C-alpha cells in the first residue's frame, strides 16, 4: 500500500493527524545519486466520521501565518482551544525501529519552503467533494447542513510551524459522502539544480450512522435534519422541551435570522434556573462535547451521545434574533 495511516481517535468524538516537513533534504548516501530536484511522497491520512464528531487536520504553517504568529504569540487562547491543543499537539513521525537504517532562520525555513502553500483560509468551510473532477471547494453546509467549522489557526503560536483546522459532521449526509483537503510546500538540496516540492493529503469518509435526530428546528416544520420542530421562525418566543438519554441524538437549529445562545453550545449550556450560561463541563468535565468554540458560524449545534457516556445534565440551548428580545429554545434533559 501507499504510506497510509488512519487519523488518531481521542475520546468518542475526536480525530486527528498531520503532515510532516523538511523531508527532501536527504543525506549524501542518497543525495549523491540524485539530480534534477526533489519530489513529493505517497503519504495519506484517512478520517472516518460519524454524526457530531470532530475532525482535526494539522499542516505546516504558511509563511503568512508564521509571521503573524510572531506578534500574535503575545495573546492568550481560551480554555477550550487550549484543551484542543492538548488533543492535537502530537506530531506523527513513526520511524518504527530506526536501527542502523536510513530514515523514511525560522522565517528562513518559511522562505526556504518558498512560503508553505497549503489549502488556505477556512480550510474546512470550503471543502472538496471526491464526487467529481471539478473538486469544487463548496460550502461545507451545502453538503452537511448545520455543520460547524473553524477557520484555519496556528497549533501553538510558540511553536509556529503547524496550523490546524476542524469541523463537526451533522446528522445528515448526502448518502456516501467523501471530502478531501491537502497541504503542499517547497524546498531544495545539494544538487546541481536546487529545487524541490512536497505534498500531503487527507481523505474524509463517513460511517453508516446518519439519520434524522431530535432538536426542535427553528426554521421549518419540514426539517431535513430533525424529527421535531418549533412553530414559526421569528417575532415571538416559541420553544420545546425533551427527555433524552445517552445513546440518543439531539440538538438545536437556528435560522439565518437567529443565532445560538449559548454562543458556544454545547460546550456552554443555558441554566434554566438563574437564567445564565454555564459550561457543559461544570459537573461533568469527563465529557464528549460535539461542538467548536472558534467556528465560522454559531447558528447550529447537535450532540451524539454514546452508550458508554457517563454524564447527566438538565440544561437548555436557545436561538435569538437580531432584536435579542427572545428566548426561543429547547430544554435538554439528558439522561434525566
Amino acid at each position, epitope marked *: 500500500a501507499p504510506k497510509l495511516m488512519m487519523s488518531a481517535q481521542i475520546h468518542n468524538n475526536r480525530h486527528v493527524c498531520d503532515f510532516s516537513k523538511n523531508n527532501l533534504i536527504v543525506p549524501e548516501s542518497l543525495k549523491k545519486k540524485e539530480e534534477l530536484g526533489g519530489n513529493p511522497v505517497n503519504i495519506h491520512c484517512y478520517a472516518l466520521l460519524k454524526p457530531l464528531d470532530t475532525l482535526y487536520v494539522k499542516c505546516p504553517t504558511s509563511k503568512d501565518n508564521y509571521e503573524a504568529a*510572531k506578534v500574535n*504569540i503575545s495573546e492568550n487562547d481560551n480554555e477550550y482551544e487550549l484543551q484542543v491543543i492538548s488533543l492535537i499537539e502530537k506530531r506523527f513521525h513513526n520511524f518504527e525501529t530506526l536501527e542502523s537504517k536510513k530514515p523514511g532562520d525560522n522565517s528562513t525555513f518559511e522562505k526556504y519552503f518558498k512560503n508553505i502553500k497549503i489549502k488556505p483560509d477556512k480550510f474546512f468551510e470550503k471543502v472538496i467533494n471526491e464526487y467529481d473532477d471539478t473538486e469544487e471547494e463548496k460550502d461545507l453546509e451545502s453538503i452537511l447542513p448545520g455543520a460547524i467549522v473553524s477557520p484555519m489557526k496556528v497549533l501553538k503560536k510558540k511553536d509556529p510551524f503547524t496550523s490546524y483546522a476542524a469541523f463537526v459532521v451533522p446528522p445528515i449526509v448526502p448518502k456516501d459522502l467523501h471530502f478531501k483537503v491537502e497541504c503542499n510546500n517547497t524546498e531544495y538540496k545539494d544538487e546541481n539544480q536546487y529545487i524541490s516540492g512536497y505534498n500531503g493529503i487527507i481523505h474524509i469518509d463517513i460511517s453508516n450512522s446518519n439519520r434524522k435526530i431530535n432538536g426542535c428546528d427553528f426554521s421549518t416544520n419540514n426539517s431535513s435534519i430533525l424529527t421535531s420542530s418549533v412553530k414559526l421562525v421569528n417575532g415571538e418566543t416559541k420553544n420545546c422541551e425533551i427527555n433524552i438519554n445517552n445513546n440518543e441524538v439531539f440538538g438545536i437549529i437556528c435560522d439565518n435570522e437567529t443565532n445560538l445562545d449559548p454562543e458556544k453550545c454545547f460546550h456552554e449550556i443555558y441554566s434554566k434556573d438563574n437564567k445564565t450560561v454555564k459550561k457543559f463541563r461544570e459537573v461533568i468535565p469527563n465529557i464528549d462535547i460535539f461542538s467548536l468554540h472558534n467556528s465560522n458560524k454559531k447558528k447550529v449545534a447537535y450532540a451524539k451521545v454514546p452508550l458508554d457516556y457517563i454524564n447527566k445534565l438538565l440544561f437548555s440551548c436557545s436561538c435569538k434574533t437580531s432584536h435579542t428580545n427572545t428566548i426561543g429554545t429547547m430544554k435538554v434533559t439528558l439522561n434525566k
Partner: antibody
Amino acid sequence: QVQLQQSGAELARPGASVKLSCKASGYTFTNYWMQWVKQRPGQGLEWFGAIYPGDGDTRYTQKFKGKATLTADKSSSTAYMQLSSLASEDSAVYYCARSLYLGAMDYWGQGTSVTVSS
Amino acid sequence: DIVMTQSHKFMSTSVGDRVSITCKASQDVTNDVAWYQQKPGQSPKLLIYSASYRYTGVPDRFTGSGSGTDFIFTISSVQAEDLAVYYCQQHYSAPPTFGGGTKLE
C-alpha cells in the same frame, strides 16, 4: 501578576560552583522560554542560554556551553542556572527573563550577583 | 551568530528633543527585533517588540522602526528620566543576540 524571583547574591571561590534559582509565578511555566542574561560589572547585556521546560530543550551561547547547566523544575515553576569552575570573568549579574520561545523578553527577574574571589 | 551593532556607545540630547538610536543586524532579521531600556541598578525593561510595536504600558514617546537590517529606536520628546542604556536584540535566529547598547545622556 507575572513574577520572577531570583536567589540572593553569591560569593564563590575560584574553581567552585554555584547554583542560581529563578522562581516564576503568575503564568503557565511550560508555555514559555526561561532564559538567562549575563551583565559583567559596567558592561552590556549578554544572552547566556535558555531552557524550554515544556519539553526540556536547552540552548546555550557557545561560549557558555562548557561551564553552565540550565535546568527547570516544572512542579515548582523554578528555573536554575548552575555555573561551574568559576573564574573572575564569571563575576556578573545574572538575570532570568521570560519570553515566548525565541522572542522578546517581557518579564525579568531582579538579578543575582555572583562575585568570584578568594 | 547574528551580530547586532549599535555604532554609538553614547548619545546626548536635551529634555524636549527628539533622539534616534540605530541598530544594524549583520544579516536580515526581518522584524524580529526588540528594544530594552535599562536604568542604573534596575533590570532591563522591554519597550519595543517586533521592531515597531510599543510593548504594554510603554509611554507614547517611545517608538521603533525598521525591517531587515537597519533598526531605529526613537524618543519623540525626551524627558529627564529617560537617561538609560538602550539595547536592541534579535530573535530571528538562535541564539538571540544583543547590541552593545547606547547610553542616553
